[PDB]
């Protein structure tokens with residue numbers, strides 16, 4: 001039910017390590033192009049490097065407020081703006097997870113709205129940090145945060161930063177997200193997706209985009225180049 | 226050679242988890258007050274909560290560009306400025322570690338300089354991510370980043386975010402930092418300091434400030450309140 005080419009067409013091939021250099025990013029783009037993936041995803045200061053080498057047809061995503069989500073709205077929004085100016089066409093922003101856990105959904109809304117309005121032409125993905133929302137609160141909060149993101153104009157909800165100790169994507173989280181907002185928003189599964197078996201599980205749960213760092217190993221699990 | 230009171234007077238009592246709430250920060254401030262520490266350190270969106278309950282004498286540190294360091298200079302500087310407006314008196318910024326590893330020390334300098342100029346009256350600490358500089362390059366790079374921080378006007382160098390897989394403070398790192406800039410700059414040891422024995426090792430190596438999250442257990446190892 002999943003060919004390598006189909007999967008590749010929904011992969012964001014990602015490098016977000018603090019120690020990443022320009023050479024690491026040009027190597028990421030070369031790998032992304034070789035694998036035929038949808039996008040590369042990089043940190044804000046490295047967008048320009050990615051944009052300078054990406055072929056037409058490889059999208060560029062940047063993260064905003066990442067990984068912690070602990071930035072005021074105006075900073076997230078300006079970071080997003082600057083990344084789009086540098087060549088990103090998609091932004092993956094992190095919510096203030098603590099605001100969500102505190103029940104301050106009006107603050108979560110305001111944050112997403114600030115970013116949305118700063119990058120109105122971009123594809124905006126909202127990282128909800130689902131493993132943390134599920135661990136520290138539960139399913140209702142995860143569903144509610146997804147509704148907040150929808151109502152604030154996000155294009156996607158996304159599971160995870162890959163940096164939080166509660167973990168990454170789970171089938172349970174993706175199913176909740178897809179059932180809550182999947183009729184209107186994309187669902188990006190990310191964090192800890194290392195194998196084709198895992199990727200397939202996420203796609204079957206309702207993911208429409210995958211965020212991978214080891215994309216070649218995942219894709220090889222679906223078939224040969 | 227260290228009394229409890231002396232150690233407390235150089236502790237920054239810290240909470241930086243993504244899931245931190247306002248009430249978590251109010252509790253942090255109360256604990257810091259009870260322990261008689263120098264400062265509390267919190268994330269930018271939580272500075273005003275901390276400032277709103279901090280007793281007389283307690284300094285407030287905010288992180289900037291944290292934890293990844295992967296933010297453009299204009300964002301780090303504006304984040305710092307906003308945190309000072311919210312009540313911070315100190316800023317602990319993170320360098321772009323990848324820029325340092327690429328040999329782009331001019332970029333590192335420009336980043337520190339931008340923050341320095343935006344918060345001229347604050348105490349500025351520069352997190353060098355010493356465990357990563359040592360792992361991926363070595364001692365000369367650590368010393369050179371300290372020289373850059375000094376020349377860009379920083380008040381302190383600081384070992385670690387506590388979030389990087391390379392690790393936290395080490396005696397080796399503190400000794401290099403102290404040798405390089407300790408006659409002019411403070412040296413803050415942070416990341417993984419859980420016990421009095423570890424804290425004392427860092428102080429003996431040349432640290433003049435400690436970043437702790439479990440400050441009571443450290444202080445109780447030195448003696449009674």
Ligand SMILES: [N+]
Pocket residue numbers: 407408409410411
């Ligand atoms: N000094």
